[PDB]
Amino acid sequence: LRRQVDQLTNDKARVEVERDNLAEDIMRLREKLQEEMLQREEAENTLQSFRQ
Amino acid sequence: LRRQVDQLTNDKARVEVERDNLAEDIMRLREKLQEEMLQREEAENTLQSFRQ
Amino acid sequence: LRRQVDQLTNDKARVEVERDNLAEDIMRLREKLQEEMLQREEAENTLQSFRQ
Amino acid sequence: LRRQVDQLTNDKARVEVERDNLAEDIMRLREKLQEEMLQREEAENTLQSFRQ
Amino acid sequence: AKQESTEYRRQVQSLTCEVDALKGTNESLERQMREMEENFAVEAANYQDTIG
Amino acid sequence: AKQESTEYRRQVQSLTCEVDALKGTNESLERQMREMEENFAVEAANYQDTIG
Amino acid sequence: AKQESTEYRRQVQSLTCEVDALKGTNESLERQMREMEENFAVEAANYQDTIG
Amino acid sequence: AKQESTEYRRQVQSLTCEVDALKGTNESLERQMREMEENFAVEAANYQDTIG
Numbered sequence: 001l002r003r004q005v006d007q008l009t010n011d012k013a014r015v016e017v018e019r020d021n022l023a024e025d026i027m028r029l030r031e032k033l034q035e036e037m038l039q040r041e042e043a044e045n046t047l048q049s050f051r052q
Numbered sequence: 053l054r055r056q057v058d059q060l061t062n063d064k065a066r067v068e069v070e071r072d073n074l075a076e077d078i079m080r081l082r083e084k085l086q087e088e089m090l091q092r093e094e095a096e097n098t099l100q101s102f103r104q
Numbered sequence: 105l106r107r108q109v110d111q112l113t114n115d116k117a118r119v120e121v122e123r124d125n126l127a128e129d130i131m132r133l134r135e136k137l138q139e140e141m142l143q144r145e146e147a148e149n150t151l152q153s154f155r156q
Numbered sequence: 157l158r159r160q161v162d163q164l165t166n167d168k169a170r171v172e173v174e175r176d177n178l179a180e181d182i183m184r185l186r187e188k189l190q191e192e193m194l195q196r197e198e199a200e201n202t203l204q205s206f207r208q
Numbered sequence: 209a210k211q212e213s214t215e216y217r218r219q220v221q222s223l224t225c226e227v228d229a230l231k232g233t234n235e236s237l238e239r240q241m242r243e244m245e246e247n248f249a250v251e252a253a254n255y256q257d258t259i260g
Numbered sequence: 261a262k263q264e265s266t267e268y269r270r271q272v273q274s275l276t277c278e279v280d281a282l283k284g285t286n287e288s289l290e291r292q293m294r295e296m297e298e299n300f301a302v303e304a305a306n307y308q309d310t311i312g
Numbered sequence: 313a314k315q316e317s318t319e320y321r322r323q324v325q326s327l328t329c330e331v332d333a334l335k336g337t338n339e340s341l342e343r344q345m346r347e348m349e350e351n352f353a354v355e356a357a358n359y360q361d362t363i364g
Numbered sequence: 365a366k367q368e369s370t371e372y373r374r375q376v377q378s379l380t381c382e383v384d385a386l387k388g389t390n391e392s393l394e395r396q397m398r399e400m401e402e403n404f405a406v407e408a409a410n411y412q413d414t415i416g
Contacts, residue, residue, distance in 0.1 A: 019155070027392050242325055
């Protein structure tokens with residue numbers, strides 16, 4: 001019984017620790033795709049505004 | 053020549069601002085939709101470690 | 105100067121279509137990307153209910 | 157024997173529902189990246205046209 | 209009580225990323241307003257100099 | 261109760277910073293309105309004596 | 313100097329949105345130190361079932 | 365200065381949006397530091413719940 005009680009005591013503490021770590025580790029991999037696409041849509045929209 | 057300039061460049065600038073509004077709305081929506089990714093695509097695959 | 109403005113007008117009209125190519129693929133992407141941020145907020149809330 | 161068969165049942169059908177959500181994440185981040193890749197392949201040359 | 213404290217931890221983490229993304233969208237509107245406002249100040253100065 | 265005390269604090273603090281960023285947006289426009297009014301008025305005064 | 317004044321005002325207003333979005337996330341670190349005190353409430357709960 | 369203004373409006377708006385994207389990156393990097401505060405906390409405390 002205690003083997004499966006120690007199983008949650010890994011499972012719960014692991015899902016809580018992995019949530020709050022991978023929030024920053026993957027948010028800082030979406031922020032860099034925003035860097036790559038703002039360097040496209042700057043290069044589109046500003047080039048209509050430079051024509052007006 | 054310069055009267056052809058004034059009447060040509062300004063009907064083009066009317067058609068160009070009829071597109072510059074779409075390119076400002078997509079560039080505004082990039083910044084927002086990437087802020088949406090910064091939370092949602094971190095949570096997504098992080099919570100698949102926990103799906104297991 | 106007039107050859108450079110007959111050119112800048114034909115350029116204005118060409119390059120508005122060459123931006124309409126990019127900004128129509130970004131406009132399709134932006135509309136599908138509002139639909140995707142709902143698909144990834146569905147992934148956040150679904151997989152966070154499954155984390156609970 | 158119950159705990160061994162139970163741990164093998166859990167590890168089996170874990171991978172069954174893990175996989176199908178992990179195939180959805182790996183599609184959700186791809187839908188974005190593939191539609192961005194379509195624009196990015198036209199947008200190579202048009203950005204040198206725009207500036208000329 | 210530890211399981212409830214782990215479900216409210218997922219609600220905390222999800223709602224943090226959701227309001228961090230809405231804040232990051234309001235900062236993205238603030239930055240797009242600046243890049244339109246930098247054009248409006250330059251268009252006003254160019255117009256007034258051209259007239260005088 | 262400390263996890264739930266972290267929920268309400270993050271949400272209220274981040275909603276306060278959203279109102280602060282939307283005021284930073286309004287102050288950028290309320291400044292730009294004066295920067296264009298100064299660009300119109302100062303160069304109208306420089307050209308008033310020159311035209312006169 | 314008015315195109316330059318429109319630039320550094322936008323960059324300073326964007327930095328003002330940083331400094332107040334950072335504080336609303338410093339008010340979020342004050343919640344992750346409560347998700348700590350809840351992970352210590354799970355230590356105290358597994359120590360309650362220990363002691364009992 | 366009229367010729368300059370045609371790049372200067374884009375340079376201003378790009379350097380505004382690149383500052384504003386670094387500002388949405390810095391608030392979202394403090395969100396990676398909050399999610400690291402939760403990771404060091406669940407590492408310290410939830411591991412000792414598993415010892416509990």
